[PDB]
UniProtKB/Swiss-Prot annotation, chain E:
InterPro entries: Ntn_hydrolases_N, Proteasome_alpha, Proteasome_alpha-type, Proteasome_asu_N, Proteasome_sua/b. GO terms for cellular component: cytoplasm; cytosol; extracellular exosome; nucleoplasm; nucleus; proteasome complex; proteasome core complex; proteasome core complex, alpha-subunit complex. Induction: Down-regulated by antioxidants BO-653 and probucol. Up-regulated by bacterial lipopolysaccharides (LPS) and TNF. One of its GO terms (molecular function) is ubiquitin protein ligase binding. This is Proteasome subunit alpha type-3. Belongs to the peptidase T1A family. It holds the Pfam family Proteasome. The modification N6-acetyllysine is found at residues 52, 201, 225. Component of the 20S core proteasome complex involved in the proteolytic degradation of most intracellular proteins. This complex plays numerous essential roles within the cell by associating with different regulatory particles. Associated with two 19S regulatory particles, forms the 26S proteasome and thus participates in the ATP-dependent degradation of ubiquitinated proteins. It is found in: Cytoplasm; Nucleus. It comes from the Eukaryota.
From Swiss-Prot, chain F:
Keywords: Acetylation, Cytoplasm, Glycoprotein, Immunity, Isopeptide bond, Nucleus, Phosphoprotein, Proteasome, Ubl conjugation. Induction: Induced in breast cancer tissue (at protein level). Up-regulated in liver tumor tissues. One of its GO terms (cellular component) is proteasome complex. Glycans are attached at residue 107. Component of the 20S core proteasome complex involved in the proteolytic degradation of most intracellular proteins. This complex plays numerous essential roles within the cell by associating with different regulatory particles. Associated with two 19S regulatory particles, forms the 26S proteasome and thus participates in the ATP-dependent degradation of ubiquitinated proteins. The keyword Transmembrane helix does not apply. GO terms for molecular function: lipopolysaccharide binding. SUPFAM superfamilies: N-terminal nucleophile aminohydrolases (Ntn hydrolases). There is a cross-link at residues 112, 205 (Glycyl lysine isopeptide (Lys-Gly) (interchain with G-Cter in ubiquitin)). This is Proteasome subunit alpha type-1. It comes from Homo sapiens (Human). The gene is PSMA1. It comes from the Eukaryota.
From Swiss-Prot, chain H:
It comes from Homo sapiens. The 26S proteasome consists of a 20S proteasome core and two 19S regulatory subunits. The 20S proteasome core is a barrel-shaped complex made of 28 subunits that are arranged in four stacked rings. The two outer rings are each formed by seven alpha subunits, and the two inner rings are formed by seven beta subunits. The proteolytic activity is exerted by three beta-subunits PSMB5, PSMB6 and PSMB7. PSMA5 interacts directly with the PSMG1-PSMG2 heterodimer which promotes 20S proteasome assembly. Component of the 20S core proteasome complex involved in the proteolytic degradation of most intracellular proteins. This complex plays numerous essential roles within the cell by associating with different regulatory particles. Associated with two 19S regulatory particles, forms the 26S proteasome and thus participates in the ATP-dependent degradation of ubiquitinated proteins. This is Proteasome subunit alpha type-5. The modification Phosphoserine is found at residues 9, 49, 56. GO terms for cellular component: cytoplasm; cytosol; extracellular exosome; extracellular region; ficolin-1-rich granule lumen; nucleoplasm; nucleus; proteasome complex. Expressed in fetal brain (at protein level).
UniProtKB/Swiss-Prot annotation, chain I:
Glycans are attached at residue 129. The lineage of its organism: Eukaryota, Metazoa, Chordata, Craniata, Vertebrata. This is Proteasome subunit alpha type-7. Belongs to the peptidase T1A family. The keyword Ribonucleoprotein does not apply. GO terms for molecular function: identical protein binding. The modification N6-acetyllysine is found at residue 226. Induction: Down-regulated by the ribozyme Rz3'X. Up-regulated in colorectal cancer tissues. Pfam families: Proteasome (PF00227), Proteasome_A_N (PF10584). GO terms for cellular component: cytoplasm; cytosol; extracellular exosome; nucleoplasm; nucleus; proteasome complex; proteasome core complex; proteasome core complex, alpha-subunit complex. The keyword NADP does not apply. CDD domains: proteasome_alpha_type_7. The gene is PSMA7. PANTHER family: PROTEASOME SUBUNIT ALPHA/BETA (PTHR11599). Keywords: Acetylation, Cytoplasm, Glycoprotein, Host-virus interaction, Nucleus, Phosphoprotein, Proteasome.
């Protein structure tokens, strides 16, 4: 009964992270998100947790939060714990834009909140953040950058992401579909439709129960595109047309 | 059944039930004190009593009737240790209403302010639940008399006639048919309802000395405790 | 559960006293087993 | 009787002891042939034991007095041959909190001092020797500490 | 089952056994009682003696908090001097700010909040010692107030604290307080205190005596034995 | 034994053993017997060391001019209160420009140890200090205990094997109020040497002696200063 | 595990969190309060029943509007309601005078529930079992939102908690679809409100609040019974 | 059972304080000797791997110009108190104009020995050996985490201190000079060491009023080797 | 009996959560390294990168200054703090005492902070370690290490992770003056000792050579193949 | 101390042992080994003597202590010595 005591401050006992193993369990609970590589732009997807049609949908962008004019994020986790991180990084990105009058580079930006989330997972017996939120944007140096926040303080930022534990079926799909230099952002958008229609548990890609948010680089506006369900409905008929075309072979 | 620290803390049970607070509900019952709060048309009468085990008992200090303001009194139940601490607090929060707002408090918000910090006493278990019970009265503009009660679970409460405590459950049951009626009540009628409800709970009807009876009426708005001379006069008036 | 649907669809067809079963009664067999699914709405949403 | 059940290994007897209380309750002939009981500790005691038939006189025996520990140990040592010049003053005061069995431990020790033994007891230090044996002796005191 | 460990938290029965532990800790202390006469208040303390154990007349439980107030305390001596300094600091605040005699009724309420606040927080502990508050003044008069570790504020004409508080208060009802002089009230305590608390349990002891009243002009000071012919009044009727 | 953990939590019997546990540390120290006469006071302690070549650590030291003290038990709380004794002794020696009597001074020490024995998260303090001093009414000898109870006495003893010291003290302490310093010092060591085992010294460097008086400032007597006190001694019988 | 300790919140091995989950079980045992978003306004119908006939509902008020144009109702337990009342009374009036104008209620739900989030989410020692139905009128289009102790804000055209939460939510899920006529939506919302309600319905047994685009108006049991039962 | 650390024992006494004495056993063994002419001390470096640099970890440090030191047990806790007292000796040389005496260095650390505060959450199990030359000449002091102060003519710590103190007091010479203390140091050294002697295995510390500081110098260890 | 470990020591005199923390360094990312009279080298690998993810995000080893570089192991979460925490102190040692950063100063800071990091109940201890890589002023080499207890120690070469003593046995032949006489043989010897560590497949292998006071540069898959060719030629001509 | 070497005196009659060995050298370095652990020390000593073909414990004069130091310390436990002082 060495690890059965509530601690949350000091680590576990063989060198493994005590709570971080359990923190990734909460990430794989009711999480949904995806990412892919796109030239001259980027694309993200969301899923509405409640498919009930009586909702007002007045939240507009909900699973996708916009922290900057040129940057946004996708929350996967508890919405209550994440809303504290929304304004947090938003004010940190605002105090940086206040100081230098220059858009905050996402290199130090992501690592700032990762160290802020790290302090709550370090000391004081404080509850860890069980929310993993993505990062997208553009900078003057490396251009398009993709990141994913982790509770432990070591970010899961890559050029691809897996949310949630159910997305593991899409990871083997993204590695097999891995490509460099071809966009055509719609090539990955049509591929993201195959991700939701196959790897995800919900089929047919219900429009009102999901969301697709894309960011196209524009100087200097950098327009962030909330779709939302408008032409996703024709993307449903577009992916089903591909399924109707694929069955013609055999 | 209990799991974890829920015995020592106020957190809710798997059935959604508090522990340290539910044990303080009968903490007033262990005090052995019955204070019934009944309000007539223009008046409200509070009836209480006390026990005299030893002949050295002083009537002054052991008297349970506490007067918060000239126009606003009160009465407590249960353990009297914590009750005095809430008495001087009600005097302090009423003075803040006098200082800041300039006039006398309706006492309807005094029950809210007291129960708000009483909820802080219910918040953290390190400061103890403070199981003293508070019953309030007062006078508001064109509202006639009022009656208020606050236990140490921390809400503001008041109605026409409300009584809660050790034996107050048997008093309110008899008064439901007794108070209605529900017409203009004379001063002698309100005192008659104090003994008759006590006669259903106790039926000892001992010397008027030990029992303490207050009244709040509008002639002079100030609250006044009944003198021992007039209590025995109204006692022999209702019993012929 | 498909076997349970065949049993529930066979109980109401037994009540109507007929040798066969109607597909509408199979829908009645589904409506009986849909009420037991998981729990809601407290905790999540 | 502990708290919860089941079960105690002696629960058959803990019911029989309470049956003895029933025999001292409903059976009048049990008023004959008085029975004596003794226990090591009162930590576990049944409240129903109060009665004349049941436990009536219950005596708490504390640690014997310093004069009492000297009298009980003298009756045990009257048979043995001890070296003369016994003041009885120091041996009584050196006995504090010690049980009567620990007194016989010194008495049984005092019977070995005749021949040699071979360690040299001499005299007047005999009693304070086995007196300290159980709870003493430092050693430390200070070492490794302040 | 672990419900009596924390003093701040309640128990499933609706009370705290830590208060019972502090109440019974006062019962283990030596007998110290008090009584108030017409023009004064009598204090007394019975100090136990084992061997010597030290110079006679020091470390006495009689304490002087204020000019017109006095202390008769029992229990652990460090907390007795601690409660003496808590009241001494409280009497220092009223004398600093105002400068006149602190009424004993409101002085008991100030010490009540102190002892009560010590029972609220589980960080500190409820004091297992009790004291006797009494005072006399020309405008105020003689009052004697008894305070318990639970925080209940109240007073009687007389009180008993020690091994047995029953047999010590048994003869106080037949004792004549008002009519008999304060000097006679001192011997009324000294006689039975020697009668009760028999010398078989404690071979040697000493009885401390203190009195404040009109004869002392409101000042509190320990009255010796041979003074006021009290030495002869002590052993006169106490030999029965 | 779980009820003895917290000092704040009262036991089922109301007796807190955390004080009694520190009473052991007071009784696990060296045997020291303090005493006073009307004229002058003589306090005695004992020294013990780790090895033979290691010098025996002294106990009795000097604080105030007219206040000598001994010590036993934990040295951490000893020197913490010793420096605290310096600050308390220089309070009136600076502002009032007069020394503080032991009567009202220890009342602050007893209150200093009350907080660690009351609030949660704190422990008692084992203290073997034997405090002496001279006010206008003559000498006073107090005692220090984790229970924070100081008693004014002519003679008292704490530490190891000190129960045999009080027995030799009772009849002697009443007769020691008369005789002067010299014979009182060698009569003081005639007590401890009966408490300590009689088969060994009792050397010069293992014992602590001190003397304080109204007109005589407190001087620490150790090593060669003990030699005048140890000469002309009556050997213990067999 | 355990493993999450507290500050701000407790732990679960599987999902959600234990401890305050038991307080969430008390939320379902609270006072049921229906709510309605209909056309240009928001309607809120609560349920209040005193223990004995000696009580008069004219004293205790379950509807305490924070602003003239924004009312509120509570679904849950006791004074933890009144705690956030005075809080929101301080919270909403601070932001009101910062920019000197009310500003659409969407930002009100943002700021007012932001501290309510922290207040309910962070460790309060004992948990808080009071949820809320948030309402208001903004730029001609009102809003009806539902908060909870867990801090998840929702949006419903017709919502219910406490009692009927299992029955009434599925009721409004079927009979009510998208947006319908104003008073016709109040009808079916009360029909499912009287589903599990007691057979005895009087002016004092319930209360109906309404948020007009002209500002909130708190009704009384008098006009509540004089309207209809059946109010429509 | 149920040890309450700084809170006392049911018997009772402190426990972790005794466990701090066990923390001296895991450290390197240092054997000090105080002589009329000076103070000599030696300790084994105990090199684990040839990657280890000999002067990287040393158990002898210099508190003040005339004050030497020998640490024990843990390192980081030692150098903490070491550099601490080095600042304490610096402030003592300012107000009083004189270097801090080896005596007062003890009580300076002894007050903070067991704080039960943020340091000393967990207490430090580091023993300290205080050498140097005060106004009374060469002195050697020994202290423990509990704060004991006893002046020892020859003191040993570490692993072999048990068997080291055995043969120590037997061959120790109080009235002799450093001439015999030279060969008297290597006696107990070669005893406790199970491996060949080289400059990197152990280190010597010798401080004298006339010859200093010194401390010690390079390549004087191998000179003592060939002098056998 | 046994309370495990929180802060206070265990009855054996040692701790547990500390000993428990060093096993994280064993299961963390392995690393190697060597030093010479002028040029120094290092290596980490253990990247586990499939090349389908961003390569700059997994980058760990950085440098406070061109003279002194940071090389750590284990998880990079707490190590990212060690970076920033040492960047502020190295910038203060830049700021105050303008001379180039001395290895004794900077290591004591991290050590003194790594001791209070494991102290309070309070600040969480480190479960990772690090090894400082760099060069002393005027071309002299410097390399040190860190311990979860907040201590520092210097080595002749960097061998950690799995088989710390096994690589150290191979480092015995590295003590010759030939290494490093030429930077061509040293890098070939780095890929030698690293060949027995983990997979050593050449993909995740990352080595940065710092010559004298010049800032190091990560070897691209060009010169690394040439240094691997002479290492394979020296192995083929060894028979 | 002298008690552990007396166990080696009777153990000199076991195995193959002569009187030239120095027992007190390593005896003080392994305290609290009783007689059972040093019995296993002289036991595993013959285990390596058969593996190494040797016979008499003085042959083998210096290298008997070589197997004596490595086996005794391995039977107690294996702990890193660098973290001890660190």
């Amino acid at each position: 009964s060495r690890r059965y005591d509530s601690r949350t401050t000091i680590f576990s006992p063989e060198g493994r992270l005590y709570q971080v193993e359990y923190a990734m369990e909460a990430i794989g609970h009711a999480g949904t998100c995806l990412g892919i590589l796109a030239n001259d732009g980027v694309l993200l997807a969301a899923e509405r947790r409640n498919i009930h049609k009586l909702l007002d949908e007045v939240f507009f962008s909900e699973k996708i939060y916009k922290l900057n004019e040129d940057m946004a994020c996708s929350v996967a986790g508890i919405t209550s714990d994440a809303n504290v991180l929304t304004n947090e990084l938003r004010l940190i990105a605002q105090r940086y834009l206040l100081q230098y009058q220059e858009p905050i580079p996402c290199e130090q930006l992501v690592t700032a909140l990762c160290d802020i989330k790290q302090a709550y997972t370090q000391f004081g017996g404080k509850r860890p953040f069980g929310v993993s939120l993505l990062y997208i944007g553009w900078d003057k140096h490396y251009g398009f950058q993709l990141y994913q926040s982790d509770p432990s303080g070591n970010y899961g930022g890559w050029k691809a992401t897996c949310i949630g534990n159910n997305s593991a079926a899409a990871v083997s799909m993204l590695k097999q579909d891995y490509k460099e230099g071809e966009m055509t952002l719609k090539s990955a958008l049509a591929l993201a439709i195959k991700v939701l229609n196959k790897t995800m548990d919900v089929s047919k890609l219900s429009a009102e129960k999901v969301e697709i948010a894309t960011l196209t680089r524009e100087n200097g506006k950098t327009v962030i595109r909330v779709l939302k369900q408008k032409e996703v409905e024709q993307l449903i008929k577009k992916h089903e047309e591909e399924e109707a075309k694929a069955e013609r072979e055999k | 059944s209990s799991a974890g620290f829920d015995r020592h803390i106020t957190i809710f049970s798997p059935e959604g039930r508090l522990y340290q607070v539910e044990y303080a509900f009968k903490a007033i019952n262990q005090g052995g004190l019955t204070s019934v709060a009944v309000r007539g048309k223009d008046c409200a009468v509070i009836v209480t009593q006390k026990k005299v085990p030893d002949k050295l008992l002083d009537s002054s200090t052991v008297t349970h009737l506490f007067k918060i303001t000239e126009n606003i009194g009160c009465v407590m139940t249960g353990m009297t240790a914590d009750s005095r601490s809430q008495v001087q607090r009600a005097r302090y929060e009423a003075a803040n209403w006098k200082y800041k707002y300039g006039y006398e408090i309706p006492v309807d918000m005094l029950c809210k302010r007291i129960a708000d910090i009483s909820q802080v006493y219910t918040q953290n278990a390190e400061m103890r639940p403070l199981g003293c019970c508070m019953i309030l009265i007062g006078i508001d503009e064109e509202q006639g008399p009022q009656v208020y009660k606050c236990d140490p679970a921390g809400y503001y409460c008041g109605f026409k006639a409300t009584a809660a405590g050790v034996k107050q459950t048997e008093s309110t049951s008899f008064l439901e048919k007794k108070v209605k009626k529900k017409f203009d009540w004379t001063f002698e009628q309100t005192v008659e309802t104090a003994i008759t409800c006590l006669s259903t709970v106790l039926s000892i009807d001992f010397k008027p000395s030990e029992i303490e009876v207050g009244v709040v009426t509008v002639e002079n708005p100030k609250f006044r405790i009944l003198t021992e001379a007039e209590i025995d006069a109204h006692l022999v008036a209702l019993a012929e | 559960e498909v076997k349970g649907v065949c049993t529930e669809a066979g109980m109401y067809a037994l009540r109507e006293r007929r040798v066969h079963v109607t597909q509408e009664d199979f829908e009645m067999a589904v409506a009986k087993v849909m009420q037991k699914d998981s729990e809601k709405n407290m905790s999540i949403k | 009787k502990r708290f919860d059940s089941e079960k105690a290994g002696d629960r058959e007897v803990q019911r029989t002891m309470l049956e003895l209380l029933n025999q001292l309750d409903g059976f009048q002939p049990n008023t004959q042939v008085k029975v004596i009981a003794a226990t090591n500790r009162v930590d576990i005691l049944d409240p129903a034991l109060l009665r004349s038939g049941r436990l009536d006189r219950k005596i708490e025996f504390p640690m014997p007095n310093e004069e009492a520990r000297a009298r009980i140990m003298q009756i045990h040592s009257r048979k043995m041959n001890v070296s003369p010049d016994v003041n009885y003053e120091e041996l009584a005061r050196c006995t504090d909190d010690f049980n009567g069995a620990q007194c016989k431990a010194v008495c049984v020790e005092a019977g070995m001092i005749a021949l040699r033994r071979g360690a040299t007891e001499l005299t007047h230090e005999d009693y304070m020797e086995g007196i300290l044996e159980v709870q003493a002796k430092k050693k430390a005191n200070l070492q490794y500490y302040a | 089952t672990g419900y009596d460990l924390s003093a701040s938290t309640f128990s499933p029965d609706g009370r705290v056994f830590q208060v019972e532990y502090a109440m019974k800790a006062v019962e283990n202390s030596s007998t110290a009682i008090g009584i108030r006469c017409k023009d004064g208040v009598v204090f007394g303390v019975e100090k136990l003696v084992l061997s010597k154990l030290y110079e006679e007349g020091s470390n006495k439980r009689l304490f002087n908090v204020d000019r017109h107030v006095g202390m008769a305390v029992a229990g652990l001596l460090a907390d007795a001097r601690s409660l003496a300094d808590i009241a001494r600091e409280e009497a220092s605040n009223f004398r600093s700010n105002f400068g006149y005699n602190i009424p004993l009724k409101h002085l008991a309420d100030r010490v009540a909040m102190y002892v009560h606040a010590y029972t609220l927080y589980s960080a500190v502990r409820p004091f297992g010692c009790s004291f006797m508050l009494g005072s006399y003044s020309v405008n105020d008069g003689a009052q004697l107030y008894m305070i318990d570790p639970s925080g209940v504020s109240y007073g009687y004409w007389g009180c008993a604290i020690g091994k047995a508080r029953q047999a010590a208060k048994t003869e106080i009802e037949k004792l004549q307080m008002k009519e008999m002089t304060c000097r006679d009230i001192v011997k009324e305590v000294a006689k039975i205190i020697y009668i009760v608390h028999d010398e078989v349990k404690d071979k040697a002891f000493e009885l401390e005596l203190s009195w404040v009243g009109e004869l002392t002009n409101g000042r509190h000071e320990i009255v010796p034995k041979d003074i006021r012919e009290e030495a002869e009044k002590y052993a006169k009727e106490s030999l029965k | 034994n779980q009820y003895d953990n917290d000092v704040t939590v009262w036991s089922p019997q109301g007796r807190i053993h955390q004080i009694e546990y520190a009473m052991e540390a007071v009784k696990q120290g060296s045997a020291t017997v303090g005493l006073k006469s009307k004229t002058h006071a003589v306090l005695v302690a004992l020294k013990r060391a780790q090895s033979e070549l290691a010098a025996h650590q002294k106990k009795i030291l000097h604080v105030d001019n007219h206040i000598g003290i001994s010590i036993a038990g934990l040295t951490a709380d000893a020197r913490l209160l010793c420096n605290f004794m310096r600050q308390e002794c220089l309070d009136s020696r600076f502002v009032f420009d007069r020394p503080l009597p032991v009567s009202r001074l220890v009342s602050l020490i007893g209150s200093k140890t009350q907080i660690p024995t009351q609030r949660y998260g704190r422990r008692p303090y084992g203290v073997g200090l034997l405090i002496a001093g001279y006010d206008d009414m003559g000498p006073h000898i107090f005692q220090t205990c984790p229970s924070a109870n100081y008693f004014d006495c002519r003679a008292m003893s704490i530490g190891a094997r000190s129960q045999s010291a009080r027995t030799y003290l009772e009849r002697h302490m009443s007769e020691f109020m008369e005789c002067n310093l010299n014979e009182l010092v060698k009569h003081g060591l005639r007590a401890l040497r009966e408490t300590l085992p009689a088969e060994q010294d009792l050397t010069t460097k293992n014992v602590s002696i001190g003397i304080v008086g109204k007109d005589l400032e407190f001087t620490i007597y150790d090593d060669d200063d003990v030699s005048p006190f140890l000469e002309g001694l009556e050997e213990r019988p067999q | 595990e355990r493993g999450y300790s507290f500050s701000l919140t407790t732990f679960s091995p599987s999902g959600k969190l234990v401890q305050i989950e038991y307080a969430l079980a008390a939320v379902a045992g609270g006072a049921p309060s229906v709510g309605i978003k209909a056309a240009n306004g928001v309607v809120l119908a609560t349920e209040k029943k005193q223990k004995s006939i000696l009580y008069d509902e004219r004293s205790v008020h379950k509807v305490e509007p924070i602003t003239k144009h924004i009312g509120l109702v509570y679904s849950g337990m006791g004074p933890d309601y009144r705690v956030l009342v005075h809080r929101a009374r301080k919270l909403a009036q601070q932001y009101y005078l910062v920019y000197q104008e009310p500003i659409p209620t969407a930002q009100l739900v943002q700021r007012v529930a932001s501290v309510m989030q922290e207040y309910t989410q962070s460790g309060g020692v004992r948990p808080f079992g009071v949820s809320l139905l948030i309402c208001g009128w903004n730029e001609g289009r009102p809003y009806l939102f539902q908060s909870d102790p867990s801090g998840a804000y929702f949006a419903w055209k017709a919502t219910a908690m406490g009692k009927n939460y299992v029955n009434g939510k599925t009721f409004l899920e079927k009979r009510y679809n998208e947006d319908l006529e104003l008073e016709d939506a109040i009808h079916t919302a009360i029909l499912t409100l009287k589903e599990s309600f007691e057979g005895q319905m009087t002016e004092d047994n319930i209360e109906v609040g309404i948020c007009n685009e002209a500002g909130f108006r708190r009704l009384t049991p008098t006009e509540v019974k004089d309207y209809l039962a059946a109010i429509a | 059972y149920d040890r309450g650390v700084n809170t006392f024992s049911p018997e009772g006494r402190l426990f972790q304080v005794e466990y701090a004495i066990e923390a001296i056993k895991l450290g390197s063994t240092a054997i000090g000797i105080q002589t009329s002419e000076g103070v000599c001390l030696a300790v084994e470096k105990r090199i684990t791997s040839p990657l280890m640099e000999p002067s990287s970890i040393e158990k002898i440090v210099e508190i003040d110009a005339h004050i030497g030191c020998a640490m024990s047990g843990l390192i980081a806790d030692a150098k903490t108190l070491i550099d601490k007292a080095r600042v304490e000796t610096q402030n003592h040389w300012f107000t009083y104009n004189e270097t801090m005496t080896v005596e007062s260095v003890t009580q300076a650390v002894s007050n903070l020995a067991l704080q039960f505060g943020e340091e000393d959450s967990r207490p430090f199990g580091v023993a300290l050996l205080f050498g140097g030359v005060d106004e009374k000449g060469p002195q050697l002091f020994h202290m423990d985490p509990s704060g004991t102060f006893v002046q020892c003519d020859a003191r040993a710590i570490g692993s072999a201190s048990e068997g080291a103190q055995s043969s120590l007091q037997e061959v120790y010479h109080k009235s002799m000079t450093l001439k015999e203390a030279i060969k008297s140091s290597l006696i107990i050294l070669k005893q406790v060491m199970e491996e060949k002697l080289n400059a990197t295995n152990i280190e010597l510390a010798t401080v004298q009023p006339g010859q200093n500081f010194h401390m010690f110098t390079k390549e004087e260890l191998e000179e003592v080797i060939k002098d056998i | 009996s046994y309370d495990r470990a929180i802060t206070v020591f265990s009855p054996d005199g040692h701790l547990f959560q500390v000993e428990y923390a060093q096993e994280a360094v064993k299961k963390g990312s392995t690393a190697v390294g060597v030093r010479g009279r002028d040029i120094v080298v290092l290596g980490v690998e253990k990247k586990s990168v499939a090349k389908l993810q961003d390569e700059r995000t997994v980058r760990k080893i950085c440098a406070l200054d061109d003279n002194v570089c940071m090389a750590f192991a284990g998880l990079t979460a707490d190590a990212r703090i060690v970076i920033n925490r040492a960047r502020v102190e190295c910038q203060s040692h830049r700021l105050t005492v303008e001379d180039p950063v001395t290895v004794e100063y900077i290591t004591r800071y991290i050590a003194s902070l790594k001791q209070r990091y494991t102290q309070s109940n309070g600040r969480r201890p480190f479960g990772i370690s690090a090894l400082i890589v760099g060069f002393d002023f005027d071309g002299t080499p410097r390399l040190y290490q860190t311990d979860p207890s907040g201590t520092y120690h210097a080595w002749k070469a960097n061998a950690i992770g799995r088989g710390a003593k096994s690589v150290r046995e191979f480092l015995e032949k590295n003590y010759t003056d030939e290494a490093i006489e030429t930077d061509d043989l040293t890098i070939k010897l780095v890929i030698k000792a690293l060949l027995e560590v983990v997979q050593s497949g050449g993909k995740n292998i990352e080595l940065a050579v710092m010559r004298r006071d010049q800032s190091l540069k990560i070897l691209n898959p060009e010169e690394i193949e040439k240094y691997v060719a002479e290492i394979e030629k020296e192995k083929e001509e060894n028979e | 101390l002298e008690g552990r070497t007396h166990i080696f005196k009777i153990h000199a009659r076991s195995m193959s042992v002569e009187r030239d060995i120095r027992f007190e050298l390593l005896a003080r370095l392994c305290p609290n080994s009783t007689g059972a652990e040093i019995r296993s020390v002289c036991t595993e000593a013959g285990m390596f003597a058969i593996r190494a073909r040797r016979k008499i414990a003085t042959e083998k004069d210096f290298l008997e202590a070589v197997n004596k130091v490595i086996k005794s310390y391995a039977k107690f436990s294996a702990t890193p010595r660098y973290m001890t002082y660190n």
